[PDB]
Amino acid sequence: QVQLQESGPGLVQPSQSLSITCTVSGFSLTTYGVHWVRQSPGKGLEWLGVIWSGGTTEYNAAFISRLSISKDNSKSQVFFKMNSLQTNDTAIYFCVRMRITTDWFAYWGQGTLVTVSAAKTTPPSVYPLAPGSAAQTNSMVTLGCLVKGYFPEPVTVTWNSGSLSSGVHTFPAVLQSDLYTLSSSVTVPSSTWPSETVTCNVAHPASSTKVDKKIVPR
Amino acid sequence: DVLMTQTPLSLPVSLGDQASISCRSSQTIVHKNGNTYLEWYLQKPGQSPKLLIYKVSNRFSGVPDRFSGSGSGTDFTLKISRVEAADLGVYYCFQGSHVPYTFGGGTKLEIKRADAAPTVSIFPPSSEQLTSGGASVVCFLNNFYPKDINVKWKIDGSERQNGVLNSWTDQDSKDSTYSMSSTLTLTKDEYERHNSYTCEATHKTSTSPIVKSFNRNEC
Ligand SMILES: N[C@H]1[C@@H](OP(=O)(O)O)O[C@H](CO[C@@H]2O[C@H](CO[C@]3(C(=O)O)C[C@@H](O[C@]4(C(=O)O)C[C@@H](O)[C@@H](O)[C@@H]([C@H](O)CO[C@]5(C(=O)O)C[C@@H](O)[C@@H](O)[C@@H]([C@H](O)CO)O5)O4)[C@@H](O)[C@@H]([C@H](O)CO)O3)[C@@H](OP(=O)(O)O)[C@H](O)[C@H]2N)[C@@H](O)[C@@H]1O
């Protein structure tokens, strides 16, 4: 299967540039085009440009003054660079094979969330949420993890190193005092916890942090 | 530029019924090579868009028979037969015939289901947070339907509006429900001035609000 793996910085200072490398596996860059697309809540999906198999590039005229796409066929890499980023360039940027005629290589990468800000990288504080010491007991118990005061997005929240995946709600982050906060709940049988350990795992790639917080009865 | 206009913006559908989604282009979209590069994408919650239909009416390899594309000129349609819970998300059309390539605004497919009351849980500040000088009180309102809901905080019986942050999930692909978090943030000092903390949910499934509460002195 196709993979379009992206690397590049999440956080870009205003007026500076965004560079993303897309590493292609599963098809030859000498034969197929690769497109770049971004997604924001305000403007939806915007096609930015394409690099065709022979190297010809086409760009969206709205961005052409500050956008560059290039590639290295032998390394199977496609390079995106955009200059002079402002706050309205905040978006998830994707390397994509789309607009297909006959091939089976359509694929959309996981994307790179790009935040355009002069605000500083800050790791999260992670707090376990156990029910109150006088809280009543039910057949299913809800536990949680409060992830507070981080920047920029994203964080990844898992439970029991990703083995506890069902019954989880990880809420969208909200931005307050220039920092993000989110919470995650998990619901498990009362005959399981606390006899069986439940731990939330929080990764914040931008600060290289990985924290585990065991949920302990109060 | 070719403007792609989708309708409707939002589409509720029962399980097993058919959904129909429209995309109109502001001009014709025949590429010079003769192909009409009209594509339909589905973006499920938490995921990247995935190709369903290419060149107007061709199902991409692996896409279920329930998805069908049609149309010509400036009028295109996606039909989803026998809708399943896993079909929820945002559907987008795309034209790749005339540069710059453009997307429609999206149509959110919502699954109808039977009403379900929220499961409400309240959490006092953690001992760890209190040690750092903060005090967040968290309330989860989980797995409810329909999506419309209201949450009220009371501190020692008085409604508190300031310092509440709310967040909502997308519709759940397993059970077609919605969830919400509500977090009341105070300083440790404000928190320790009061005793009773209450999260109250109002939802059409109950006549009375659903109340979860704790007393700081009973902790
Ligand atoms: N009748 C066609 C025939 O005429 P000639 O053989 O007499 O020239 O071929 C013409 C194209 O000539 C070849 O051009 C390539 C270089 O092509 C590109 C480049 O790759 O850099 C791209 C060109 O752009 C077009 C085009 O004008 O043909 C239009 C684009 O919208 C797009 O549609 C591309 C490609 O066909 C896209 O290819 C894919 C894809 O990425 O999706 C992948 C393919 O594998 C295949 O699946 C096709 C589909 O069949 C859809 O077509 O999709 O084409 C254009 O920008 C030229 C530019 O003008 C500079 O040439 O660059 C040459 O390759 P290189 O040797 O590597 O340089 C090749 O030598 C030429 N023969 C075509 O235009 C005529 O219609």
Ligand SMILES: *[C@@H]1O[C@H](CO[C@@H]2O[C@@H](C)[C@@H](O)[C@@H](O)[C@@H]2O)[C@@H](O[C@@H]2O[C@H](CO)[C@@H](O)[C@H](O)[C@H]2NC(C)=O)[C@H](O)[C@H]1NC(C)=O
């Ligand atoms: C996206 O934003 C740019 C930048 O706008 C400026 O910087 C922003 C951070 C904000 O502070 C704005 O108030 C500023 O105007 C827009 O480009 C500017 O557009 C105006 C004309 O509308 C022009 O006077 C400025 O010189 C432009 N600056 C630059 C660097 O180009 C741009 O138009 C916005 N794009 C869209 C699609 O709305």
